[PDB]
Design an enzyme around this catalytic site. Structure first.
Site, mmCIF file in Angstrom:
data_model
loop_
_atom_site.group_PDB
_atom_site.id
_atom_site.type_symbol
_atom_site.label_atom_id
_atom_site.label_comp_id
_atom_site.label_asym_id
_atom_site.label_seq_id
_atom_site.Cartn_x
_atom_site.Cartn_y
_atom_site.Cartn_z
ATOM 1 N N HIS A 40 0.830 -1.222 0.000
ATOM 2 C CA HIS A 40 0.000 0.000 0.000
ATOM 3 C C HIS A 40 0.858 1.264 0.000
ATOM 4 O O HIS A 40 0.311 2.354 0.011
ATOM 5 C CB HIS A 40 -1.005 0.039 1.194
ATOM 6 C CG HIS A 40 -0.503 0.335 2.611
ATOM 7 N ND1 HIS A 40 -0.020 -0.552 3.454
ATOM 8 C CD2 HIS A 40 -0.451 1.542 3.343
ATOM 9 C CE1 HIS A 40 0.309 -0.009 4.594
ATOM 10 N NE2 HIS A 40 0.047 1.272 4.534
ATOM 11 N N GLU A 52 19.269 7.583 7.810
ATOM 12 C CA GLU A 52 18.540 8.729 8.357
ATOM 13 C C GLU A 52 18.199 8.636 9.816
ATOM 14 O O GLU A 52 18.050 7.554 10.352
ATOM 15 C CB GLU A 52 17.174 8.897 7.676
ATOM 16 C CG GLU A 52 17.224 9.352 6.234
ATOM 17 C CD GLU A 52 17.452 10.871 6.181
ATOM 18 O OE1 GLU A 52 17.235 11.443 5.133
ATOM 19 O OE2 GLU A 52 17.839 11.385 7.205
ATOM 20 N N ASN A 54 17.243 12.315 11.497
ATOM 21 C CA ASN A 54 16.347 13.484 11.290
ATOM 22 C C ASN A 54 16.058 13.511 9.798
ATOM 23 O O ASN A 54 16.982 13.773 9.045
ATOM 24 C CB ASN A 54 17.051 14.784 11.697
ATOM 25 C CG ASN A 54 16.083 15.951 11.581
ATOM 26 O OD1 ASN A 54 15.265 16.027 10.696
ATOM 27 N ND2 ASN A 54 16.145 16.907 12.443
ATOM 28 N N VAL A 57 16.867 17.116 8.077
ATOM 29 C CA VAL A 57 18.259 17.702 8.137
ATOM 30 C C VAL A 57 19.292 16.735 7.609
ATOM 31 O O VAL A 57 19.241 15.581 8.012
ATOM 32 C CB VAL A 57 18.653 18.050 9.618
ATOM 33 C CG1 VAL A 57 20.109 18.578 9.674
ATOM 34 C CG2 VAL A 57 17.662 19.079 10.175
ATOM 35 N N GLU A 62 23.621 9.766 5.532
ATOM 36 C CA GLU A 62 22.501 9.483 4.609
ATOM 37 C C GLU A 62 23.017 9.091 3.237
ATOM 38 O O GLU A 62 24.073 9.542 2.824
ATOM 39 C CB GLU A 62 21.613 10.694 4.295
ATOM 40 C CG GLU A 62 20.880 11.197 5.524
ATOM 41 C CD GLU A 62 21.611 12.322 6.299
ATOM 42 O OE1 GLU A 62 22.810 12.468 6.191
ATOM 43 O OE2 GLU A 62 20.920 13.013 7.005
ATOM 44 N N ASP A 84 0.149 -7.743 1.756
ATOM 45 C CA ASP A 84 0.606 -6.322 1.721
ATOM 46 C C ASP A 84 2.131 -6.250 1.865
ATOM 47 O O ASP A 84 2.655 -5.912 2.908
ATOM 48 C CB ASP A 84 -0.027 -5.547 2.855
ATOM 49 C CG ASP A 84 0.262 -4.023 2.735
ATOM 50 O OD1 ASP A 84 0.712 -3.612 1.689
ATOM 51 O OD2 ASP A 84 0.004 -3.341 3.704
ATOM 52 N N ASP A 171 1.281 2.170 19.554
ATOM 53 C CA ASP A 171 0.996 1.486 18.252
ATOM 54 C C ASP A 171 1.778 2.149 17.154
ATOM 55 O O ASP A 171 2.364 3.192 17.366
ATOM 56 C CB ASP A 171 -0.510 1.661 17.915
ATOM 57 C CG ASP A 171 -1.131 0.810 16.772
ATOM 58 O OD1 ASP A 171 -2.264 1.125 16.422
ATOM 59 O OD2 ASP A 171 -0.466 -0.102 16.316
ATOM 60 N N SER A 172 1.769 1.549 16.000
ATOM 61 C CA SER A 172 2.466 2.144 14.856
ATOM 62 C C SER A 172 1.227 2.918 14.257
ATOM 63 O O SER A 172 0.096 2.797 14.737
ATOM 64 C CB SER A 172 3.049 1.014 13.887
ATOM 65 O OG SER A 172 2.039 0.062 13.582
ATOM 66 N N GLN A 174 -0.033 5.526 10.473
ATOM 67 C CA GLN A 174 0.195 5.916 9.057
ATOM 68 C C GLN A 174 1.554 6.660 9.019
ATOM 69 O O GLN A 174 1.866 7.532 9.825
ATOM 70 C CB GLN A 174 -1.007 6.796 8.628
ATOM 71 C CG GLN A 174 -0.789 7.560 7.225
ATOM 72 C CD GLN A 174 0.003 8.738 7.502
ATOM 73 O OE1 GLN A 174 -0.295 9.400 8.477
ATOM 74 N NE2 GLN A 174 0.977 9.031 6.736
ATOM 75 N N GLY A 175 2.331 6.307 8.040
ATOM 76 C CA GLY A 175 3.698 6.932 7.898
ATOM 77 C C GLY A 175 4.740 5.892 8.297
ATOM 78 O O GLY A 175 5.859 5.887 7.814
ATOM 79 N N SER A 177 3.874 2.840 7.977
ATOM 80 C CA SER A 177 3.492 1.828 6.910
ATOM 81 C C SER A 177 4.720 1.315 6.166
ATOM 82 O O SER A 177 5.534 2.141 5.802
ATOM 83 C CB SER A 177 2.639 2.442 5.809
ATOM 84 O OG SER A 177 1.694 3.135 6.592
ATOM 85 N N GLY A 178 4.842 0.043 5.933
ATOM 86 C CA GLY A 178 6.022 -0.467 5.193
ATOM 87 C C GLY A 178 7.268 -0.744 6.043
ATOM 88 O O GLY A 178 8.159 -1.456 5.633
#
Ligand SMILES: NC(=[NH2+])c1ccc2nc(-c3ccccc3O)[nH]c2c1
Ligand SMILES: [Ca+2]
Ligand SMILES: [Zn+2]
Length: 223
Positions: A40, A52, A54, A57, A62, A84, A171-172, A174-175, A177-178
């Protein structure tokens, strides 16, 4: 991540941020050229950001690499979110080091009660939206299938498992996700869905990675 804590810079070296001008999903580095995320989270124009902490920044460590291809599981059902999972191949291999490392795929599935580490830059509010600049972590246990199925009657397939707290507050979201659900150093889950975030009796549901190891290996071997 709602009710979690700041992981600490680069303490979760396999965590990646999928970016299209902003962070929209997480993922896990499983080798130097492949990342596993959720179906999704699919979209075109993905830049994978490794090392990563931050995400707003450039602090050093990175590595920004474009995705060469994204492979959504052929049987992914966007309505039930069954299967999924998605694999992303990077245009070039990442330079692995102590800040950017891969996580191992499991050999067996995890049992109810196993404590896992879930991480991400997803929303931190259950009511409202606040997305953090640095990576957030949450330690959560895998729940039993009877508890999971009692919370989500008729919506849990054998390719999903619940992890979290039934009292709510952790909990986890949205964001996230994955992103990864790591238990005893193995990637056992992918942040998939849930009813809202951190609500009582509505734990998070994760893609059960142990059920896709041969699919991942075969797919990576032919691409
Ligand atoms: N509560 C949870 N553990 C959870 C985790 C990931 C989610 N991702 C979503 C989500 C919902 C609607 C549209 C996009 C999403 O990424 N909801 C989520 C809920
Ligand atoms: Ca950064
Ligand atoms: Zn999501």
């Amino acid at each position: 991540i709602v009710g979690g804590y700041t992981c600490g810079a680069n303490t979760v070296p396999y965590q990646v941020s999928l970016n299209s001008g902003y962070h929209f999903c997480g993922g896990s580095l499983i080798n130097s050229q492949w990342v596993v995320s959720a179906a999704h989270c699919y979209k075109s124009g993905i830049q994978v950001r490794l090392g990563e902490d931050n995400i707003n920044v450039v602090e050093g460590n990175e590595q920004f690499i474009s995705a060469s291809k994204s492979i959504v599981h052929p049987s992914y059902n966007s309505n039930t979110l069954n299967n999924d999972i998605m694999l992303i191949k990077l245009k070039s291999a990442a330079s692995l080091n102590s800040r950017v490392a891969s996580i191992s795929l499991p050999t067996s599935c995890a049992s109810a009660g196993t404590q896992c580490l879930i991480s991400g830059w997803g929303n931190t509010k259950s009511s409202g939206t606040s997305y953090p600049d640095v990576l957030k972590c949450l330690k959560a246990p895998i729940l039993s299938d009877s508890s999971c199925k009692s919370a989500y009657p008729g919506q849990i397939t054998s390719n999903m498992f619940c992890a979290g707290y039934l009292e709510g507050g952790k909990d986890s979201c949205q964001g996230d996700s994955g992103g990864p659900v790591v238990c005893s150093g193995k990637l056992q889950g992918i942040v998939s869905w849930g009813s809202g975030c951190a609500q009582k009796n509505k734990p998070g549901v994760y893609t059960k990675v142990c059920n896709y190891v041969s699919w991942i290996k075969q797919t990576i071997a032919s691409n």
